[PDB]
């Protein structure tokens, strides 16, 4: 571990600076180092971890799609395939890294709903990103489904329907259904039920909580508009 000699608190501080500098590869390396100190992560620290790797993998996904589109046109020299493979392998490495942190040992030490659902959602997300490039394709999809389903089950028992973690989980699981599992009707049903049950719970919330919940509800609506 490159970060083994740096203090946990210093790693977190530098993750926050890296975010301000839009240096997301650094941010992710700092948060990986923080995780590897072996202590549980706070709410803020979990979100630093997620934001860092989301930005890293996002650049890789966007690049992979550009290259895959070029490759597909060229099949209507080996360089396009070779370089698409290069980016794909780097993407799979980042996903494997995140899954490794969740398995060693973030999930097994997460007992509170807000932490356990957060990590299981991430596990579904990074299996989903592996699924987007897979051509074990079925087992990867079922690993995503399993993680999302366990997170859903916990969130329905332990969190109110406006909880932003629960809402973001349902959003992402809906997209999994639509795009990965080829289950558009399941995706639409989940998005609609999630939106309506949050709507009916907004009356319980403060102004600040209302803003957090309605932000994600709008993403559910955006998708439903394209899907129906």
């Amino acid at each position: 571990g490159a970060m083994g000699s740096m203090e946990r608190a210093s790693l977190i501080q530098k993750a926050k600076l890296a975010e301000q500098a839009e240096r997301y590869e650094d941010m992710a390396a700092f948060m990986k180092g923080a995780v590897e100190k072996g202590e549980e992560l706070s709410c803020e620290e979990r979100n630093l971890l997620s934001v860092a790797y989301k930005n890293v993998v996002g650049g890789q996904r966007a690049a992979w799609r550009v290259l895959s589109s070029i490759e597909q046109k060229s099949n209507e020299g080996p360089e396009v395939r070779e370089y698409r493979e290069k980016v794909e392998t780097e993407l799979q490495g980042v996903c494997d890294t995140v899954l490794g942190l969740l398995d060693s040992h973030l999930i097994k030490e997460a007992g509170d709903a807000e932490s356990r659902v957060f990590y299981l959602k991430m596990k579904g997300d990074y299996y989903r990103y592996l699924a987007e490039v897979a051509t074990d394709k079925k087992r990867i999809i079922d690993s995503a489904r399993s993680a999302y389903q366990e997170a859903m089950d916990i969130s329905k028992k332990e969190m109110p329907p406006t909880n932003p973690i629960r809402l973001g989980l349902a959003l992402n699981f809906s997209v999994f259904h639509y795009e990965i599992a080829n289950s558009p009707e399941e995706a639409i049903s989940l998005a609609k039920t999630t939106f309506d049950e949050a709507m009916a719970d907004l009356h319980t919330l403060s102004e600040d909580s209302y803003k957090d919940s309605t932000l994600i509800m709008q993403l559910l609506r955006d998708n439903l508009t394209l899907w129906t």
Partner: peptide, 12 residues
Amino acid sequence: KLMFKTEGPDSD
């Protein structure tokens, strides 16, 4: 590809 909305930074 048309990318649907998912949670968090739309970094792709």
